């Protein structure tokens, strides 16, 4: 008897965990919109990152019901983190910012998943 989550159920449960990331300043700033390699001056970005992901895209998928299960949402969040850890050097701002967001996320998501 597989459990169905309504889009609205998932938005109500998961969106606050995304808002937790949005709220982190300065750490969220590089994550709030799609990476634009040209504006940023990193033209090898899409050479290396083949599945880009960012907060605004995750928000939009919640807002349009594109996640059928909570793990799909969590996977997109980790996708965004894994892209940043892959592309950026360990000493960089964005790498360290990513690690800060990942710590915040883990603390926020665990209770929500138990609830779901
Ligand atoms: C997610 N990002 C955002 C970013 C922002 C600036 Br500024 C420089 C490099 C990057 N790379 C990323 O992976």
The verdict on whether omega for the bond into residue 26 sits within 30 degrees of 0, i.e. cis, is yes
* Residue 66 CB less than 6 A away from ligand 1: no
Q: How far is the CA of 97 from the centre of ligand 1 (A)?
A: 10
CB neighbour class for 82 (10 Å; exposed up to 12, middle 13-18, buried from 19) = middle
Distance CA 28, CA 37 (A): 17
Yes or no: say if 14 and 62 are a contact pair by the CB < 8 Å rule.
yes
> How many of the other CB atoms lie within 10 Å of CB of 45?
16
Backbone angles phi, psi at 69, to 5 degrees: -140, 150
Ligand 1 closest atom vs CA 42: 9
- Which residue's CA is the closest to the ligand 1 atom numbered 3? 30
Distance CA 9, CA 12 (A): 5
The method of structure determination was X-ray
* Residue 35 CB less than 6 A away from ligand 1: yes
Yes or no: say if 34 and 52 are a contact pair by the CB < 8 Å rule.
yes
* Residue 97 CB less than 6 A away from ligand 1: no
Distance CA 57, CA 71 (A): 16
Residue 81: give its domain's CATH number.
1.20.920.10
Q: How far is the CA of 43 from the centre of ligand 1 (A)?
A: 12
Residue whose C-alpha is closest to residue 98's, from 112, 116, 77, 115: 77
**Number of domains, the chain:** 1
Alpha helix ranges (H) inside the chain: 7-22, 37-40, 45-48, 55-63, 70-87, 93-115
Query: If you compute the radius of gyration of the chain from its CA atoms, what whole number of angstroms results?
Result: 15
Owning domain of residue 25: 1-116
């Amino acid at each position: 008897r597989k459990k169905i989550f309504k889009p609205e159920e998932l938005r109500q449960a998961l969106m606050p965990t995304l808002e937790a990331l949005y709220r982190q300043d300065p750490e969220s700033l590089p994550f709030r919109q799609p990476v634009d390699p040209q504006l940023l001056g990193i033209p090898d970005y899409f050479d290396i990152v083949k599945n880009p992901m960012d907060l605004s895209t995750i928000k939009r998928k919640l807002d349009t019901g594109q996640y059928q299960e909570p793990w799909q949402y969590v996977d997109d969040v980790w996708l965004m983190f894994n892209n940043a850890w892959l592309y950026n050097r360990k000493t960089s701002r964005v790498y360290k910012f990513c690690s800060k967001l990942a710590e915040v996320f883990e603390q926020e998501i665990d209770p929500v998943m138990q609830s779901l």
